[PDB]
Symmetry: D2
Subunit: 389 residues, 4 copies
Amino acid sequence: SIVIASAARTAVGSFNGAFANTPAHELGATVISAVLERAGVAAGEVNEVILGQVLPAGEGQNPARQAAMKAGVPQEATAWGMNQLCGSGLRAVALGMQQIATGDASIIVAGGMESMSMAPHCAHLRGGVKMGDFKMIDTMIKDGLTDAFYGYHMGTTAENVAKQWQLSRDEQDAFAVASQNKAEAAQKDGRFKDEIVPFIVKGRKGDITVDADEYIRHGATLDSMAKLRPAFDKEGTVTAGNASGLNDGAAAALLMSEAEASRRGIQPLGRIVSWATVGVDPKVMGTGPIPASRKALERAGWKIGDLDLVEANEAFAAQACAVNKDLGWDPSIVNVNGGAIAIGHPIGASGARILNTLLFEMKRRGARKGLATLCIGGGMGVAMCIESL
Amino acid sequence: SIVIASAARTAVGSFNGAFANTPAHELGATVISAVLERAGVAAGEVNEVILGQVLPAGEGQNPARQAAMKAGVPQEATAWGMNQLCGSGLRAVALGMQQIATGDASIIVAGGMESMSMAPHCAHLRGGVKMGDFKMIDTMIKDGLTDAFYGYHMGTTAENVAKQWQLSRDEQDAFAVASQNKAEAAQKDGRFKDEIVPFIVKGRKGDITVDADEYIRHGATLDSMAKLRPAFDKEGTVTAGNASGLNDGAAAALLMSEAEASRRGIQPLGRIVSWATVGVDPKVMGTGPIPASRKALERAGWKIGDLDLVEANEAFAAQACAVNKDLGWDPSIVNVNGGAIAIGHPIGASGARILNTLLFEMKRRGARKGLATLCIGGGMGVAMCIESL
Amino acid sequence: SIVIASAARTAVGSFNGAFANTPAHELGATVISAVLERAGVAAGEVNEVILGQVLPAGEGQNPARQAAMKAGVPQEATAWGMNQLCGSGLRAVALGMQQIATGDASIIVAGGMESMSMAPHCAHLRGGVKMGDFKMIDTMIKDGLTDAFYGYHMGTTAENVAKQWQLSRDEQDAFAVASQNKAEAAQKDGRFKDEIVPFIVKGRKGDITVDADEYIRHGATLDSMAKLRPAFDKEGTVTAGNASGLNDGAAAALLMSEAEASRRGIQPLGRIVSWATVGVDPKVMGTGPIPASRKALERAGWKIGDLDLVEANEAFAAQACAVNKDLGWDPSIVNVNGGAIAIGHPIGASGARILNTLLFEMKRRGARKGLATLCIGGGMGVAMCIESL
Amino acid sequence: SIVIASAARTAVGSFNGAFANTPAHELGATVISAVLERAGVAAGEVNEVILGQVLPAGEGQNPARQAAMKAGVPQEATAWGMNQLCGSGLRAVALGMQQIATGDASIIVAGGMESMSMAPHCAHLRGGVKMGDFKMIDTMIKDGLTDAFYGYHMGTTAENVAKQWQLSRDEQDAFAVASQNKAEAAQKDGRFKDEIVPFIVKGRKGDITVDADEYIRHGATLDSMAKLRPAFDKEGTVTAGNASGLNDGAAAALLMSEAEASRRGIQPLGRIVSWATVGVDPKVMGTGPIPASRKALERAGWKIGDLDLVEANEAFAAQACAVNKDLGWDPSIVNVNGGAIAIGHPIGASGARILNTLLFEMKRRGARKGLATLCIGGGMGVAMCIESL
Ligand SMILES: CC(=O)SCCNC(=O)CCNC(=O)[C@H](O)C(C)(C)COP(=O)(O)OP(=O)(O)OC[C@H]1O[C@@H](n2cnc3c(N)ncnc32)[C@H](O)[C@@H]1OP(=O)(O)O
Ligand SMILES: CC(=O)SCCNC(=O)CCNC(=O)[C@H](O)C(C)(C)COP(=O)(O)OP(=O)(O)OC[C@H]1O[C@@H](n2cnc3c(N)ncnc32)[C@H](O)[C@@H]1OP(=O)(O)O
Ligand SMILES: CC(=O)SCCNC(=O)CCNC(=O)[C@H](O)C(C)(C)COP(=O)(O)OP(=O)(O)OC[C@H]1O[C@@H](n2cnc3c(N)ncnc32)[C@H](O)[C@@H]1OP(=O)(O)O
Ligand SMILES: CC(=O)SCCNC(=O)CCNC(=O)[C@H](O)C(C)(C)COP(=O)(O)OP(=O)(O)OC[C@H]1O[C@@H](n2cnc3c(N)ncnc32)[C@H](O)[C@@H]1OP(=O)(O)O
């Protein structure tokens, strides 16, 4: 029924690094043209562009429409942004699948984009401040990384799961090192090259082509990992080294019925067999993926053991270990090329970034059944099962 | 197959008016609870909440999830926000319907919410400003009302459509006055009572219950209308009087299969027969509804003549006249109780606001076929056809 | 040797009141024009303009020169601002006197101006804020009213003075109320008309002439003052009622040698016999007037008992009572037309505002010896003796 | 009559350089302690502290007093800041002299301090911004470098002066390069060591001692000056290389009667023989020094040819050449150790910084008569004559 004809993602930038002054719709446009080019589909055949994006403050009207127009998709197609926090990227793909499944569209470009670097500071000032100091709020932290129910950071929610699952520092640290070493190993062997579409950082005193994940760290040591101080709980266990980072990036998929891809002679990266989204306690939002994955598997008619490859988003080492511990899937087939701790976590783009890595790894090793899943702030999980053809 | 079991909207606040300090999710909570109580469905039975919202800067992580939790939808449910600018409120409902249509959900609350008053001022300040003044940008203007491709305001787009359609000042003014007069009549006659759920503005020095659309102007004259100066084009034709305003509000609908409503004893407000979204030139974005309405009639298998009631959002008199002129529907069945010029236009909530208006008027006059449509900044239209049961 | 030929002040405005959006330099230029007019002196004869001013942030290069240029003082004269906090308006007069006493000028305009309403919020942003919320600081509080050594408000130094002199709430409120009733009666009787020069607040939708002190409360009651909550110490004694307010105004004096005023046939408002400035502990800065008045009296060769009238500025009733208790002057000759609790406290202007008040009352009742004195944040006092000719 | 018993200055910091986060009062405190130590005068004997400062926004209540307290000056002493823009640090000395001349003080510490790096960005937000962007104003530019009458930067006044005196790019550049070459030669030979007092930048990760002017460029080339583009008039003649910079620093002098220096066995740096301040057209502010120096010499009884050494502040090479051309003093006795284009221009402190340079060079070469003068924004000049004893 619905297949991902092609896919592409930019490299994931570090915070205030290579994409520091790049609006997310510019990386979005590059990724949208990439998918088109890759499948051999003309921009004019796109019905709609669906892009998850959690932090658009200051970017102007509907950045998803700006991305589409800049990538050549005519003014006749439509475009919209959506937010389901970290799940956005993946959710958007399911939403475009639904556009086709109900017969409302033929071809959708879906994924997410995000510029955490470009997220601005703000204040509500229409009433005015008659007397006294007032806070300038960092919208990336307020609107993207702070739980709205308990007022604390995602990091504390990770601590909640750490304590609850009795996941020691050394255990999270071990997990972190492995994702670095695995992300570094994969990048060195050219395993991220099919998925990445170089992005040209338009300069003045030089244009720069970015085609490598700059957030991965080469030669990560356990010693350096164990000397870092806890970033959220002063006598905590979560640190900067075992937590994902603040990053920029964009990732997308080209969707169409399976019959359509056959009419066009396209070899699809996979069929979307199912997807799902379930809520959980906001305090332990990191557990999100447990219920959602299970549901997704139930809806696809598959067992956990049927999965050949898995991409479970690395928000925090504590949550990742808890996910894997509970689900019990074989660790060796999960984040084979490294995860968000090494790669990065451009919130609104991450769900599509991990779908790209899944998709191109599944083709590369010939795996048939796959699943991508992410935890979501506010206590939610999103999962999707993909099957190759 | 999918019906609108119940619906509710808060009154529409004036800018920095009744809801001046009310966060959009608060307005949404109340509309989530209203739709739930008006259909007899428990919050625990809600699977997902979808809320169109264009300006959430600074409201924290995913205001839709905040709204849902505040209203009592359990943490096991899911929520998300989406942005197709002005069509957001209506598109949510279509998106929600698709959730049930693909069997991924049973019961959904969809609509939109917006606090234009609470939109903050922002600046990207991570680099630091070594020297020189910098701009604190109004996200309301920048992210909600400015065309991202031509840099001008929506009002200019309206001017483009007036010139194009040769719509004179007097003819735009005549439409505005009638909109005010129909809204005022409607309000005096208790015609907005069913759809409105009174909202309690939690005070300190007292609570204030708001149950009336405060932006409608009583006794609007043609003289006062003709004295106003053009707001966007210095020697233009669009004024503050013949353009909608800046406003706050929320509206939603409770969706479920026709079968499910039947199992429950609910008498639905309507069956969603079709919906459609189409793009047009950003410069003449107000023509959006033409192609969109036509596409949705096509998908429903209806002729324009088949409609008994229409709600075509009045962003600007010049675009509303163009639309009506083009489509040729009977003016007498369009915005029977007044439109956005009088009622206001809380961006992300406006499509759900007009769906409420349509739906309660179809039940009260016994209309069978109705259509709701809105122009969208960036150059898009959205439309939905509803049939009574 | 040096006399005050004439003086003028603007009415004192309420915080964000009649001069809510009037830069201080506009209020200062009207006072410069009035002192000139009053003395029969032309703006081309002024050598230098000296204006105390504590909060000039954002008003642009040297506001004293902006006021001087606006008044028509030639470009060949000079002008400068100074800041000895609340004693500023009075210390500028002392400093203007000194220019003439040393032969460096013949004609000086000296006093103060302040727009507390127009003070801005600020932040040091050159280095950049990598991430996190940051404070926008009210410059009026931080630079005008917070002690820099102890970090608390001037209000807390008043509580310190209340404890140490054992001043009860009741005694302070009675002083406060008498301050209001004396001001009201001298306002109603027209005793502020001579000193005040009307200020024209330039409208758009109408020019407004301001010629009355608007912070003075009419029919102030003991009861409503008694009911107020402490404002600085949750369980203190200083309240908004018995403390001075936040205000806007300007005030000045025209100076020249006695011999010069004699050549011109000018009947001066008085001779500056002496002045003094002395420091005290910043914790009890309200006590400043004690050592400073004793020193000005000593330098004049006068006993406390030789004074006929006194203007002892009312920062807080706690400190005014203390000052009066220690000096032991007859209370009936102190602030006979009310004081700053009623009239207000536009920080840099205050010392010249009370000087104007002293001057015009000395002329009206034929008082021969007077003194003006103020307390100063930071732990200082300033006083000036004046004798009539 | 009045002498300068001792003097000291901190090295001049580069913009956002060595003193990037050092509040001005900390730099002033080290210079007050240096002057005391230098004169064998204890802080308990100081009567008053007078500090020129143009941009104190956000540093808290009267920074002059903060500096004085930090240096141990007793709370019984007084302190104030003043602002005659660029003339401030020199005016402070003339005003402190006046304190003593009139018998109100015996011992004064007077000069200036400025942290242009710490000046903040601000906005008047008390009335609120109902809608539309607002500017965050750079207080350094607005309040220190922008002319309030014509709206343009001090650099445009320099273009006015270059046009009017027909100073070519080439001649300004040759003046700029010799200013750098002379300051560098003086720094390398140890000539700034007597006047500089080392300032310790209290760090966390290490304390840094700053005792070298860091803005002076070594091996400055004419070629590099010539290639620069005009900074203020796109087709102008003033550039970043021929203009002074934005800088941080403090400087002062300790003052007492000549008879009191004699009682103490102090060998003073000089006798203040006269000073003067005169205005000029704001558009040609740079010419300030002409009438002020001519008036100061007149008051001294000196002809221009009587001076042995001159410090004429180099705001811009255009105005410094105009001054020199008009006055006609032998250029080889002016700014013999380089001037502000090389050393820097910490607005409020500059006048005291060049007074320190004059004094210590007069003592080294045995120069008997000197003069220090500066141009001032808003159209003013200040000058001081000094004779050695
Ligand atoms: C459901 C969900 O998915 S919710 C999650 C959505 N995203 C999040 O919740 C946020 C996760 N990320 C964050 O919030 C941030 O990245 C934080 C708070 C963990 C870290 O923020 P910062 O302190 O600004 O990060 P930063 O990159 O500076 O880390 C600090 C240091 O850790 C070091 N570090 C990080 N990883 C490693 C590692 N593997 N090995 C060694 N050093 C490391 C960095 O190199 C840096 O060194 P430095 O101090 O010399 O610069
Ligand atoms: C696809 C699309 O939908 S795009 C549309 C999305 N929304 C928009 O595009 C914006 C349209 N609305 C706007 O941008 C604004 O409301 C504007 C620019 C037209 C007006 O903004 P403002 O100038 O701040 O509006 P405001 O309410 O002050 O109008 C000014 C005056 O007009 C008067 N006025 C307005 N309507 C009338 C009337 N019918 N009769 C008499 N006077 C009237 C107001 O009462 C007011 O009088 P006042 O100056 O004494 O207060
Ligand atoms: C050495 C030196 O001079 S330092 C002194 C320099 N100035 C200062 O130190 C500060 C003194 N002033 C202040 O800081 C402020 O005015 C404060 C903190 C005391 C009050 O600030 P606010 O709380 O914002 O003042 P505000 O005007 O709102 O007073 C609150 C209320 O008291 C009421 N009130 C004040 N005086 C009276 C009175 N005499 N009778 C009855 N009610 C009164 C006001 O009407 C107001 O009523 P409301 O809440 O219904 O509006
Ligand atoms: C009365 C009165 O005194 S009014 C005067 C008060 N002060 C003023 O009016 C302002 C004077 N100064 C200024 O406004 C500023 O210094 C300006 C606008 C001229 C320059 O500001 P900026 O552009 O930010 O200065 P900046 O230090 O970056 O200069 C730019 C470049 O010129 C280069 N430059 C400056 N001088 C030289 C030189 N002598 N040789 C070679 N290069 C030089 C700098 O090295 C820098 O190179 P980069 O771009 O690789 O960094």
